[PDB]
């Protein structure tokens, strides 16, 4: 009954959910770490507070993992095609939203750490600013759950 | 910058359009069309073959040509203050031409293999002829691109050796060993292309 | 009967901690923090368990097993 | 009680000038106090106790110097007990000597 | 060695022996939760449960022997943490 | 040298007016220690040739004072992490006593492997047991010093992570076969009925239908041990762990606004207790009360026979906020639910203008009356 | 991975949930720290 | 009956609504974060005013989410190809309008913040400029509801 | 039954699992090795510690290998198309997630070596950030194992 290619869009969903989320988290980590490394030269103490963007990059890859697992556990040969496009939509919607989140987490997670080195009072601001980056990945996850479970 | 961006735009647009088409013919169930089978069968084996032969020469010649001027430019520029360079360091050019030699060798060998089928039906053309046209393309592509990369590397390292000589003559003899490791890549391209060629027959 | 008894046990356990805590706790600044620790512990620990058991009630689907496991679960339990 | 932020007060002190050194020492041993700054003009030479702080800074440098010289000789610093402050009189000059 | 490696060897010794003896028990009681963990083969869907029981005993010995090796890592590490 | 440097540094905070014989200074202190500083001033005079006891008057026209809370081994870290986001206003509600459990609780929900809970517990215990030694050791291992300063809080969250790992029934991908099961032995799949499907199950994967008589019924432990080995386990586990996190988050949010009302009562402000808590709690409660009711309701109202064509929780939530139930695709859960959905959102939305505008208008009227 | 890194991950995630998603209902976090000026800082 | 591929364009709708809105919200946040961080050192008191462009970039991601949810909740296997193209339209409309709003909000929410510390009177001007940015996301939402509901 | 072409995707999965992981581990190595060399001149003693990023890049090459081997050992002359797609997805999902971790370890490794040379206290914090890079490869492995075995 169902088309042979039907599962292809499902598995590309699951892959995309991870890949783009990993790219996001990678960029987020890479930028933040570069800033942290540079700042630590005159700031041996801020290091442990400064890692916070890196962790916020990490959760994006986990949001990808949630969806990627959810899709993967709901694949089968007999899949109804409509379920596969739902799963594709989910995997992109978390995957690329996590990519976008990772870009914001990266730029914030550089600049905010540098600013905090220049002025410790920025820390709270950087926390708030970084939340409004990481929440993108969460919105990606919300719709990706609605889609995958529809 | 700009002239690269114009080309990059065409490159990205090409792949974007293939993704659109790949989805389109899949989702509309038209994916019975664009079966790679008819493309790889209705194409003439002679097309694949002659591209192969011409690649084997021309890519080797490109690798060698870059090879030549990259070292030569340094021979000349160091040579102003160190005229001794020219006679001995020219061996890099000889190895760049050896990459061209590897081209012409493999190309002439490939060029003996092709003969007419007197046929146009894929079944009358038969597996041997297709397999030959592909294998010949593969061989000519293999040697061609391997030599392309080999010659550029030899030119680069040989330039370095020439500029080392300009400061101390003894450095040339020592450093020259890397031109062998460069040149060997072109020979490896030849070896593979021989083996890819080794089973072919046409007509 | 048999499901409700576990609920009553765990409900009573965390509730009785919150009830008995103020009687056991001493005077002075530590008092209110220690009592609040018992109170918040009872609330959170009861709720987390309560959800888990209520979610375990009335399963809409059962476990899926591999061919090899299906044969061996005949004898090994 | 720790369910809310603790109660505090501000007070104004008739700080006697010859008591003040000992008053600060007792208040610092107590520790449960925070001074308001009544001297917005405070700077290295504009402050009320220029010499006493500059003496303490040089005495810290001389202490660091002799400590490094004993450490360079590979000799342990003795490191035992606790000690009171110097009283209000200038007996710090014997420490300088 | 150094004291850091000896402290790690103490922790892995204790944790290892605990988990490996518990595994040795779960294998020797032939527990059903271990079906995906035991290295069974097609020949174990023939003759009867004695075939899998022989494997469960051998794997129970693997964990017992590994626990013995972690007791030796313990005794070594309790010397090294004092010696370094 | 340290004591002298500190004394003379502090003395530079004093002032001398043109008519003034003494020094003048001001201090903040805890109200409990206004006596302690007076004893220190009396002693400070007596430790000198001076007779005047250097006493004080309490100030009345005060600015907002520096904020304080007392700490001990169990509370130091919890206060520091509160201070790390920012220092409270004077007399403000302290989050820290609620944080003492709440932070460890959410961490344990996160970190809920039974074996990791033990290993972290053990690490924190070895720091507490060695405390008298560690306090004298090298300061240079700053990593160990930081976690050592968290040792008691790390222990508490370690204990809760054991507790969560127990309910999740997993240590290191292993579960307690000590327990009974809601799963049933292979003979129960072969009651004449289902035996044919068990013969297919004697070549390929099969799903237990959880049908009555075959099924082992309601379960008194944590999660059934079989879900460690079952190929579909992650689906089951995800249905749980999502729904859990929602309810827990909702409850902590409702506690946060309750802490807001308590803080507003501690400041004794009639506007804040009215225009803060009332609209906020009603807004949240009208959405969330229904949602939690639906979550618990499905587990009571639905069972194995109803599983085929069962409704979605998330859809019945989405179609509350959007009203958008299409008379189809999902079964409605109870009589009048459509009217309830409409009512609850309308009641919540009717709260917003009070916060948005009516509080601001009263503040504007107060500025116009203060003339 | 787990005992170190995912521990620190979980620690910080939950800490963050406290700092805003809980505390922002009721806690202003604006003020001056009371500093005990003391010989304890030697 | 309706063509079985038709749900593909519908999920591309929900995804685009989320993804492009997240890309907008990311770039709005990233530029604003650089701005706030670079600014903070000279005038640290300005952070609690200067976060506001980030909130607006957050609002763009919310506009995407509102559409992406409404699309996802409306999908079905049998979906008429007409409705599926409406949903693609709605998804691109909000999503790319959000991306546009995020480009504005980013450039303004950088430069305006870096101006504001040099001259505090700019702050009200930066708010007024940003209203005319954030509204693009709202126009995207308006069209996206008008499409996806009809 | 199955299409003779159909093993192509699973094979592209096996290839991709290695290739993109290798591109990652290579870039991570290459960047870190440049950093180590440019650091060593000042601080030779740091080499034996500052090598760690290269080791973690090596881990990514292993995550590739695992999946590549697993797919390859799972191939068969008449493979079910659904299984071939699962293998493709596994292959990309580790392969590109390893690329993403390779980027991250690369950038962090290079910058973090310079940081360590200029402030040795950084090294203990850098390891955390490097784990937060390297784990993206592991999340890609988790999904890839799930897909291949599903």
TrEMBL record, chain B:
Q: Do you know which Gene3D superfamilies this protein is assigned to? A: lithium bound rotor ring of v- atpase (1.20.120.610)
Look up and give the membrane topology term: Multi-pass membrane protein
Q: Where are the transmembrane segments?
A: 6-28, 48-69, 90-114, 134-164, 171-195
A GO MF label: proton-transporting ATPase activity, rotational mechanism
**Principal location:** membrane
Tell me which residues make up the V-ATPase proteolipid subunit C-like domain: 51-110, 137-195
Q: Name one GO cellular component term.
A: clathrin-coated vesicle membrane
The UniProt keywords, alphabetically, are:
Hydrogen ion transport, Ion transport, Membrane, Transmembrane, Transmembrane helix, Transport
Which compartments is it annotated to reside in? Answer: Cytoplasmic vesicle, Clathrin-coated vesicle membrane
Keyword Nucleotide-binding attributed: no
Assembly, per entry? V-ATPase is a heteromultimeric enzyme made up of two complexes: the ATP-hydrolytic V1 complex and the proton translocation V0 complex. The V1 complex consists of three catalytic AB heterodimers that form a heterohexamer, three peripheral stalks each consisting of EG heterodimers, one central rotor including subunits D and F, and the regulatory subunits C and H. The proton translocation complex V0 consists of the proton transport subunit a, a ring of proteolipid subunits c9c'', rotary subunit d, subunits e and f, and the accessory subunits ATP6AP1/Ac45 and ATP6AP2/PRR. Interacts with IFITM3.
Function of this protein?
A: Proton-conducting pore forming subunit of the V0 complex of vacuolar(H+)-ATPase (V-ATPase), a multisubunit enzyme composed of a peripheral complex (V1) that hydrolyzes ATP and a membrane integral complex (V0) that translocates protons. V-ATPase is responsible for acidifying and maintaining the pH of intracellular compartments and in some cell types, is targeted to the plasma membrane, where it is responsible for acidifying the extracellular environment. Proton-conducting pore forming of the V0 complex of vacuolar(H+)-ATPase (V-ATPase), a multisubunit enzyme composed of a peripheral complex (V1) that hydrolyzes ATP and a membrane integral complex (V0) that translocates protons. V-ATPase is responsible for acidifying and maintaining the pH of intracellular compartments and in some cell types, is targeted to the plasma membrane, where it is responsible for acidifying the extracellular environment.
Q: What family does this belong to?
A: Belongs to the V-ATPase proteolipid subunit family.
Q: What is this protein called?
A: V-type proton ATPase 21 kDa proteolipid subunit c''
Q: What is the lineage of its organism?
A: Eukaryota, Metazoa, Chordata, Craniata, Vertebrata
From TrEMBL, chain E:
Give yes or no: UniProt keyword Protease.
Answer: no
Q: Does the entry feature the keyword ATP-binding, yes or no?
A: no
Residue intervals passing through the bilayer: 6-27, 59-83
**Gene Ontology terms, cellular component aspect?**
membrane
Keywords (A to Z) from UniProt: Membrane, Transmembrane, Transmembrane helix
Provide a Gene Ontology MF annotation, just one. RNA endonuclease activity
Q: Name one GO biological process term.
A: endosomal lumen acidification
User: Which InterPro entries does this one have?
Assistant: Ribonucl_Kappa, RNase_K
Q: Where in the cell is it found?
A: Membrane
Q: Where is the signal peptide?
A: none
Q: How does it sit in the membrane?
A: Multi-pass membrane protein
Family (UniProt) = Belongs to the RNase K family.
Name of this protein:
Ribonuclease K
Species of the source: Rattus norvegicus
